[PDB]
Structure formats: structure tokens, C-alpha cells
Amino acid sequence: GPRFTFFQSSRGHCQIMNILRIYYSPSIMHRYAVVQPLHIEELTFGAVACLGTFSATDGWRRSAFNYRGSSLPVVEIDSFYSNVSDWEVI
Amino acid sequence: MDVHIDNQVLSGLGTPLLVHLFVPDTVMAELCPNRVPNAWCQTLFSDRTGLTRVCRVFAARGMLPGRPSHRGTFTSVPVYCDEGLPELYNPFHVAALRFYDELVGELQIYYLSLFEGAKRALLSRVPVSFSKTRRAIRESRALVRGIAHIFSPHALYVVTYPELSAQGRLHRMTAVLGAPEREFRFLISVALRISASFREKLAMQAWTAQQEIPVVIPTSYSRIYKNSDLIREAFFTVQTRVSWESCWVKATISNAPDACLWIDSHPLYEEGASAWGKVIDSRPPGGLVGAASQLVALGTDGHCVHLATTSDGQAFLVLPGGFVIKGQLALTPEERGYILARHGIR
Amino acid sequence: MDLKVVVSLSSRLYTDEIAKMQQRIGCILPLAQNVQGLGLGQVYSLETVPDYVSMYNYLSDCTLAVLDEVSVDSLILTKIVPGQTYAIKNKYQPFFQWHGTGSLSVMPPVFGREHATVKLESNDVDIVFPMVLPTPIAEEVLQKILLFNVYSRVVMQAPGNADMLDVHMHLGSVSYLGHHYELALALLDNLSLYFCIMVTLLPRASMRLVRGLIRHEHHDLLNLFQEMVPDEIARIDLDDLSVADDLSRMRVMMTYLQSLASLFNLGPRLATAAYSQETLTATCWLR
Amino acid sequence: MDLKVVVSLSSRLYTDEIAKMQQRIGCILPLASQNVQGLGLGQVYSLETVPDYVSMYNYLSDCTLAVLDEVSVDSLILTKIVPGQTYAIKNKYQPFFQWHGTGSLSVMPPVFGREHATVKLESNDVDIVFPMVLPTPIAEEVLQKILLFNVYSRVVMQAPGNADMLDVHMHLGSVSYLGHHYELALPEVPGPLGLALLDNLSLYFCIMVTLLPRASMRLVRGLIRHEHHDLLNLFQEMVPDEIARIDLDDLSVADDLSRMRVMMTYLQSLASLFNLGPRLATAAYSQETLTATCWLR
């Protein structure tokens, strides 16, 4: 079953596919040995969009997000410039 | 067993039946230093010498057998000599491989050592490698059996297994010499004609040295090397067991790609099977003075004889001491095409 | 900064020219000012065939522009900066959809040549607006027109293989976000031909590249898992061909795969934020 | 929006280098973020390694670019490339490329020799090599030619009968241009990240070879059976074994939709792998002063 993850990198807008392909490489065939598709689907392993850019001056500062039951660590990003791109398959 | 199902669907064009095998690291360590290769199949015939097309064999090393008893490299040998029906086996029939990473080391194997042990060991969908699914379910010990090698006295493991009809026809085949008898006689034939060329070049001249390469020589050179001490020049022709490693053929393979110099250097008297088939380079920025440094480092070798071949058809023999005797290389160009098909493409 | 561009028309105009700019004020056109070369009016001239790759490479060559006003002689229009957002309507002869699509496309109208070409008898400029349509609509209609013209040329070669009823049951009906649309019908012929030679050159090129990269990583998990999948019928016939013809095949193969990859990418890629149904307009910025 | 970004040196830029640095004004330079090393392309393209044109392409595509505007002594100023701004670039590159059609300009590493876009800095122990700027289609065919040589040098060396190693060095040869042909630099070993790029490309190739549309096979078989088209001239009226043996089956409407759908998403992924390096869309290039006004596309 799927999962979302959020990736921060100051590297290239066009050289983000290769490094994330390398990042998801140790998982893909390791859990893809047991599955085989049919009626053909299931070849696209994930897809990635760029939410946008925040400045290199300000970093991301960890904080705590608490509901009334308990708390959770949360990451604060200031001064964002949200320019949502399209989903790109890995 | 990855290379077994890696060249079983690729080499099927050039070859009907493919054999799966192992080479131990201990037997092929004297073929190549530091395990530098990581192949090319060319099976030569016993009585039907000819020439055949070269087949490619995918081999990957550093990966063990299923046995923990021995750990060696992977390989495969194509069998395509049997004309039409493969029910006939050719006995005493060699198969020669050119395993390589960057062409280094040669392997020769009989068909008889192969086949006797092979019977001894016993809205689309995606495409599936049916051979890969059928290979995976055997996974047992007795698929691999150890068989002695007649060329080099070691056990060569073959892996065969009741896979499909392609190996299924293989063990049912049986049938009712001279394959290494030719290659030694051929090389010694060209070595005899080269020594005869050097004989007539020393004969039409005075029995003298021209000394192409300068090197200083002591006064005791006629003492510590005796008068007419051609002991190495006697036994040179016995010491050339190999040709395809030799620099003698390196001139013939380099005529089409322009012309450099190649060196076959041998020990004055059994100091080791020294060296065969090296390069003297004028291409890189070492230059002609850099090649001259190599050539004077060659002539200063006081414990080795040297033979030189040029790519344009000339042969030289450099004595230890800087002396040299000029000579000729030229032969019938059928044997040029023979060596050129023995190595690779024409 | 006035991003507006002024164009002087040659002669005087008349009534339905005003009616058709009032029809086409919301829709947009590319750029090169000079009243002849305003948009795609130098590709849709009938003395040449209206081709798709020449028009597409022109559209990717030049910029884009929003028509805003047409007086008796002026053509008031603004162009597209990547900086700030402008307002866009449909005003298109196919009236497709805007349901919150975060990715847009601008393609020349494959549904009708005359559907977007507006003509004036006094002014021969025959200007024309390429069809703006959302990205799943765009990819679905480009598939359903490319495979349709492939099938048409194959029936023209041999009609016994392919039919028309079972392909009009499926390849004439795009369906996206609950809406079921209908469409049926040179440029797509040559576009299909480029794909036709690319998909027939892809086998030899694919086996040559996987045979070059097959044992680089001498025991890889990923390389072996991409080698276990593909066709056993495919990987046999490579070593028979000469060197120069092979490399010419790979060179033409690489040129047209880069061309068809940039062509399957949707060219002028607009992006919308909030679409108003009752005014038929959305805000857009260039992306 | 700041643009005037100075780069402080640490030693005296002597007058033998001030002349050639003022000669290179209006060119493009890549940035690190200044320090004297890492501002240029000599930090990743040194004399010690092979010129691989991929790791330096990765440094060009990862970090941003900058126009050189003024070179003083002891310090020089740089002007960044933030989008939405129109930058004026002069063609000050020794392999000349005339911008007649004024297409989208495109950065490249100096694959036409280090010697034309280098500058010798003897103030500090650093050498700076300038990136090459040229229009998009020449850039893409340079990419395809350098990857074809990087994949084919090894397999021509891999043959035991290497009678023709020099066949690819002239067959690839120069770049394909009408007015003049421009030879380039060719590396023997593709290096690490070039092979990683070919590995990802082989991944994508073998995945899309699992789905071939069978319908175009019938059309190319018909065009073979019909008159020989000039685009068909690479076949010279021959049906190979593979296209003859992938057409034993029938043609339907079922497979074609899912085939062309996954071909749409994989060709968009291949365009994303070929949208490689920062590019510059060009409008109103004035030829009489050789200035191509560009915004960051």
C-alpha cells in the first residue's frame, strides 16, 4: 500500500529524478520480487512533484505539533514560494 | 546461475544448444593475473579445420556456486559444431573461449570432457522468462559435477539439470583427433620459417651485428657469453608454445587498425615463461623519444632474448647486448586470414 | 510595465470581424508588430500542407499572447511573462472542461482546422488559435487521434486487418472526470510515421543498449531485475548488421525519440489555480 | 531582487589575465552558492580525471548560472540568473554558432576542447573553464552523440577483431551542421555518472520494450511493400528478423490503449530525463550587435 514522503533538496530542478531513483532503488526490486503485474498496470513505481521553493537563507526548524491526546514532532518552513509542478513518475 | 539464463536466450541465434559451466579460480589464475577478465566462443574443428563465426558468452565473476566446497567464476560454452542433427558428437574436438574484460587469457576445452560429465551429473501482460522460472525450482546439489580437464589438470564443474527439451535432447546424443596437433605444428612451422629467414639474413651478410639499438658492452662479453653462444637462439623455437599471446600475431591483427612495434621477450635460459605480446607505442605523448627509452631499456636487458615484429611486415631479433639481426615476416595470406579468423573478424 | 503589444491592421474591417473577436477575446494565440506573422497563420496557409511537427516546433519556438481588443484598425493584445498571472477563458470551438486541473496544455486544434481558424475576406491573415485543453484531456485525445490515423493508414494498406466499428466504440470517446466526450474524423499521418519508425527502431536499439549495459554492475539487484522482465523473442538478432548502418539507426532513433519526448510533453504548459464556472474563466500563470 | 554579486579573490589578478577576462565579458558562468575555488567549472573538470561531460553537466544543472559583467583587479562581479528577468548574452565563444532562427539557447560543458573556453588564473591555484552556449537542437544532438560514443567505445573495444576503432571517431565525428562541421572531444571511458545515466536510460528502454504497439509494425511493413520512403532509407528495402517475428499475432483495440498510455507517461519521463540542464528561451535576438535577450525558461 502506498505512502507519501516529502523531500527537501537544494539540488537541480532537472537532476532530482536521478538521485531519487537512486534513493528508492534499494526498496523497489527488494519488494518487487514478490509481485508481478497483469492486464498491464503496476509498472509506475511512485510519482513526484515539486511543491515549490523556500529560501536557502532560512532553514527548516523542528517544532512540536500536539493534539489534545499527545504530541508529534513537526517541521516548520518559513518564507515559502509554492509553485506546484506536475507529478513526475520515478 | 545467472549467466546460465543470461546467454540461453541471446546465444540461441548463433547456437542451438548452450551448456552451463563453472571455472574454478585456481585453474584460471595462471591464465590471467589479478582476475582481470570479466567472453567470445570460437570452436575449432579437429579434422575439418576451417573457420567459424564468433559467438558471445555472458560471464559474471565473483559469485559462488551453490556448493560451499569450491568458489569460482561462471561461464557457458556454445555447441554448434554438429551439423544438422546434433545426435552425432565429434570426439577429441576442442572448444576455444576468449574470456576478457578490456582481450586477456584463453581457454580450450574438449567436447568429450563436456559431454561425458553432462550425462554423469544426471491490456497486455508482461513477458516472463520461462527458462528462469524453470531454472529456479531445481536448485539442488547434484546439478553440478566435477570433471577433470585434459589441457590443465584440474576439475572443471559443469552444471546441467533436467530443464527443458533443449538439454533434453543433449544427453541422448552419442557417436563413434588432431585438434591440438595442428596449432602446435602451425606455430612451430612459422617459427622455423622465421628462423630460416634470420639464417639467410645472417648468411647473405657477414656473420656480424648491425646493432640497431645502442647499449654499452663489457670487454668480457665474449667470455661470459661464450663464442657462438646461441643456446637461447637454439632453444628459442622450443620456448614458443603460445602464438595468440605472442607478439608474432599482434602485428597481423593490427594491420587493419596504423603501425607500431611488438615484442616477444624470452629468459636467456629457463628463468620463467617471461612475456608475450607487448606494445611499443608511438601514439601517446611519450612520443618517439619515449619509445626510444623503452627500446634502450629493452636492449639493456642482459638476461633475456628479444624478438621484434613490426605491423608493416618486418621481423627483428634483438640479442641481449643490443645486437640485432634483420629479417622478413611475409607469409601466404591464406594464413593471414586464418589467424585473423582465429582471433576475430576478417 | 505594459506587457501589451500593439498591432496595426492593414485595411478597414466590418461587423462579423467584431463578432468573431468578441468570440475569440478570451482564447489565446502565439506570437512571432507585423500583421502577417501574428500566430499560426503562416503554417495554416493551404499552399503548403498544415503539418503538426512544423507548427509544433514553431509554437515552441515563439512565445504566447492573450488577445485583448480589436478596434477599427488596432489589435490590442498582451503577451505571456512567466512572472505574473493573467485571466484565461475557454472561448473554444470544443468547449471541453475546466474541473480544477492543475496542469494545462496548448496544442494546435486537431479536432478542426476551420474550427479555430477565423477568416476575413478583406484581410487574408487567416489567424487561428491553438486549442487549450487540460493535460489528461490532452493526452487522451492525442492517443485517440494518433492510433486512429495509424489504423486509417493501415486499413488503406490492407483493410482486412483493422475495422472501424470496434475502434469507434472505444477510440472515439474520451472520458475524464465524469464527463464523456465524443470526437471522430497528413499531419497526424507524418506524426504517426515518426512514432512508427521509432517503435520499430526501439527493438534493435533496446537490445543493443541493454547488451551494452547488461554487465556493467557485475552483480546488481536493479540491473538483473530489469533484465529478467523483457521479451525473450526480442534479444536475438543484433550482431548480424554492419557498424555504420547500426549507428545511423541509433542516431536517427535518438533524434526522433528526443523529438517525440518533447512533443509528448505538452509544449506550452499553463497552470490554473481557481476556475469560475459562471464567468467561464480561470486565473493562469505560465509554467 | 539583487543581481550584483561580487566574487572576492585573494591574490592579484595580473594584467596577462585581465586582458583575456575583459575579453570574456557577457559570457555565462556557473555559481557555487565568494571563495576563489568552486566558482566556475574547473572545480569539477580538472586535468586529473577523464573529461566525462556528465558530472560537469550535473554541476551545471544542479547549481545556477551567472553572467560575467565586469572584471576588476583583485575581485570580479557576477550577475545571477533569477527567472522573470531578460538577460542579454553576447556570443563570445570560439566555436561560433549563428543564431539565425533564434531558438532556445542551451548551456553545455566545453565538449569542443578545454582550450577554447578556459582561462588561466595564475593569481590563485585555480583554472576556470567556461560553459558552452548554443541552441537547443545542436545541444541535444551533442548529448546523443556523446552518450552514443560513451556506450560504443567499450563495445568496439570489446570485440577481439577490433580492426575498426577509428570508425566511430569519424562516423560520429564532427557535429552535424550545415555551414561548418565542428569536431569535438571524445573520452575513451565514460566514467561513473555517465554510466549511471546510461543505466537509468537502459532501465527506461527495457521497460518500454515490454510494450510495443503492433499497429505501426503493419504500417512499416506496408511501406516496405509499398514504395521506399526516404525516411525508410535506413532499412534499404529489408525486413529484419525481429519485425518479421513480432507480427505473427493479430491487431486489436484492446492492447493499444494501455500501451499508448504507459508510453505517454514513459515518454514524458524521458523528456524529463532529456530536459537536462538549464535552458534559455530566446526572443528578439539582435544580430547586428550579437545580443540574445533571454529569460530563464
Interface of C with A in 87-106 (CB under 8 A): 102-103
Preferred mutation among C222, C224, C286 to probe A, highest tally of A CBs within 10 A: C222
* Contact between chains at D242 and C166 (C-beta distance less than 8 A): no
Longest CA span, chain A: 49
* Contact between chains at A40 and B128 (C-beta distance less than 8 A): no
> Containing H/E element for B252?
helix B250-253
* Contact between chains at D255 and B344 (C-beta distance less than 8 A): no
* Contact between chains at B123 and A36 (C-beta distance less than 8 A): no
Q: How far apart are CA D84 and CA D99, in angstroms?
A: 22
Q: How far apart are CA D185 and CA D110, in angstroms?
A: 9
Alpha-carbon dihedral of residues C56, C204, C206, D157, nearest 10 degrees? Answer: -120
Resolution in A: 4.3
Preferred mutation among D153, D156, D158, D209 to probe B, highest tally of B CBs within 10 A: D158
- Residue entry with cell 586477456: B104
* Contact between chains at C229 and D207 (C-beta distance less than 8 A): yes
Q: Which residue of C has its CA nearest to B3?
A: C215
Solved with: cryo-EM
A35 part of contact set with chain D, CB < 8 Å: no
C-beta of residue D56 within 8 angstroms of C-beta of residue D122: no
What 3-state DSSP class applies to B309?
A: strand
Alpha-carbon dihedral of residues B250, B255, B260, B262, nearest 10 degrees? Answer: 20
Q: Where are the beta strands (DSSP E) in C26-98?
A: 28-30, 64-70, 74-79, 86-89
Side-chain-facing half-sphere of D20: CA atoms under 13 Å: 16
Q: Which residues of D touch B (CB under 8 A)?
A: 157-166, 210-211, 254-255, 257-259
Q: How far apart are CA D109 and CA D95, in angstroms?
A: 13
Preferred mutation among A13, A18, A29 to probe C, highest tally of C CBs within 10 A: A29
Preferred mutation among C209, C213, C215, C219 to probe B, highest tally of B CBs within 10 A: C215
* Contact between chains at B126 and A39 (C-beta distance less than 8 A): no
CA angle C269, C272, C278 (to 5 degrees): 135
C-beta of residue C142 within 8 angstroms of C-beta of residue C171: no
Q: Which residue of C has its CA nearest to A30?
A: C221
- In the DSSP assignment, the letter for residue C128 is B
- From C132's Cα to the closest Cα of chain A, the distance in A is 17
Q: How far apart are CA B114 and CA B77, in angstroms?
A: 9
What 3-state DSSP class applies to D153?
A: helix
Which phi and psi (to 5°) does residue B254 adopt?
-105, 10
Side-chain-facing half-sphere of D280: CA atoms under 13 Å: 29
Residue C25: Cβ within 10 Å count: 15
- From C108's Cα to the closest Cα of chain D, the distance in A is 18
Interface of C with A in 49-78 (CB under 8 A): none
Q: How far is CA D28 from CA A12, D35, D40, D42, D133, in A?
A: 18, 18, 10, 14, 8
Of B123, B124, B126, the CB nearest to A36: B126
Q: Which residue of B has its CA nearest to C230?
A: B127
Q: In B, which residues are within 8 Å of A36 by CB distance?
A: 126, 128
Q: In A, which residues are within 8 Å of B125 by CB distance?
A: 37-40
Which phi and psi (to 5°) does residue B126 adopt?
-75, 150
In total, the C-beta contacts within 8 angstroms joining chain A to chain D are: 42
Side-chain-facing half-sphere of B145: CA atoms under 13 Å: 15
- From D14's Cα to the closest Cα of chain C, the distance in A is 42
B249-253 CB contacts, 8 Å cutoff, 24+ apart: B249/B277, B249/B339, B249/B343, B250/B277, B250/B279, B250/B309, B251/B309, B251/B310, B251/B311, B251/B313, B251/B329, B252/B336, B252/B339, B252/B340, B253/B339, B253/B340, B253/B343, B253/B344, B253/D161
Q: Which residue of B has its CA nearest to D160?
A: B344
Q: How far apart are CA C58 and CA C48, in angstroms?
A: 15
- Residue entry with cell 538478432: C237
Q: How far apart are CA D23 and CA D36, in angstroms?
A: 20
What 3-state DSSP class applies to D78?
A: strand
Q: In B, which residues are within 8 Å of C230 by CB distance?
A: 127
> Containing H/E element for C117?
none
Angle B181-204/B231-239 helices, nearest 10 degrees? 150
Q: Which of D30, D27, D62, D60 is nearest to D133 (CA)?
A: D27
* CB proximity list for C140: less than 8 A, separation 6 or greater: C174, C175, C176
**Ordered alpha helix ranges (H), B165-210:** 165-168, 181-204
> Containing H/E element for B107?
strand B107-110
C119-122 CB contacts, 8 Å cutoff, 24+ apart: C120/C13, C120/C17, C122/C11, C122/C12, C122/C13, C122/C14
Compute CA B223 distance to the chain's CA centroid, rounded to the nearest angstrom.
Answer: 39
* Contact between chains at D164 and B257 (C-beta distance less than 8 A): yes
Q: Which of D16, D7, D120, D131 is nearest to D69 (CA)?
A: D7
Angle D191-208/A17-32 helices, nearest 10 degrees? 60
**Ordered alpha helix ranges (H), B32-96:** none
- From B214's Cα to the closest Cα of chain D, the distance in A is 34
Alpha-carbon dihedral of residues B46, B47, B53, B55, nearest 10 degrees? Answer: -20
D262 part of contact set with chain A, CB < 8 Å: yes
* Contact between chains at C196 and D220 (C-beta distance less than 8 A): yes
Of A14, A40, A41, the CB nearest to D61: A14
Q: In B, which residues are within 8 Å of D166 by CB distance?
A: 257
Q: In B, which residues are within 8 Å of A42 by CB distance?
A: none
Q: Which of D95, D196, D208, D182 is nearest to D151 (CA)?
A: D196
* Contact between chains at A11 and D196 (C-beta distance less than 8 A): no
Strand partners, B317: B307, B325
CA angle C152, C158, C164 (to 5 degrees): 40
A85 part of contact set with chain C, CB < 8 Å: yes
* Contact between chains at B344 and D259 (C-beta distance less than 8 A): no
* Contact between chains at C218 and B61 (C-beta distance less than 8 A): yes
Preferred mutation among C228, C229, C238 to probe B, highest tally of B CBs within 10 A: C228
Q: How far apart are CA B166 and CA D242, in angstroms?
A: 22
* Contact between chains at C82 and D203 (C-beta distance less than 8 A): no
* Contact between chains at C247 and D141 (C-beta distance less than 8 A): no
Q: Which of B85, B107, B77, B104 is nearest to B14 (CA)?
A: B77
Of C225, C269, C287, the CB nearest to A29: C225
Q: Which of C151, C186, C149 is nearest to C166 (CA)?
A: C151
Of A15, A40, A56, the CB nearest to D211: A40
* CB proximity list for A67: less than 8 A, separation 6 or greater: none
Q: In A, which residues are within 8 Å of B123 by CB distance?
A: 39-40
> Containing H/E element for D197?
helix D191-208
* Contact between chains at B127 and C229 (C-beta distance less than 8 A): yes
Q: Which of B5, B53, B59 is nearest to B28 (CA)?
A: B59
Q: How far apart are CA C55 and CA C114, in angstroms?
A: 16
Side-chain-facing half-sphere of C183: CA atoms under 13 Å: 23
DSSP C175-235: EETTEE------HHHHHHHHHHHHHHHHHHHHHHHHHHSSSSSTT-HHHHHHHHSS-TTTS
- From A36's Cα to the closest Cα of chain C, the distance in A is 10
Q: How far apart are CA B331 and CA B194, in angstroms?
A: 10
- Kindly tell me the burial class for residue C173, based on how many C-beta atoms sit within 10 Å of its own C-beta (0-12, 13-18, 19 or more): middle
* CB proximity list for D266: less than 8 A, separation 6 or greater: A89, D204, D207, D208
In total, the C-beta contacts within 8 angstroms joining chain B to chain C are: 38
Residue B133: Cβ within 10 Å count: 11
* Contact between chains at A28 and C222 (C-beta distance less than 8 A): yes
C-beta of residue D50 within 8 angstroms of C-beta of residue D188: yes
Q: How far apart are CA B341 and CA B53, in angstroms?
A: 8
Strand partners, D293: D88
Q: How far apart are CA C263 and CA C55, in angstroms?
A: 11
What 3-state DSSP class applies to D294?
A: strand
B128 part of contact set with chain D, CB < 8 Å: no
CA angle D187, D188, D189 (to 5 degrees): 95
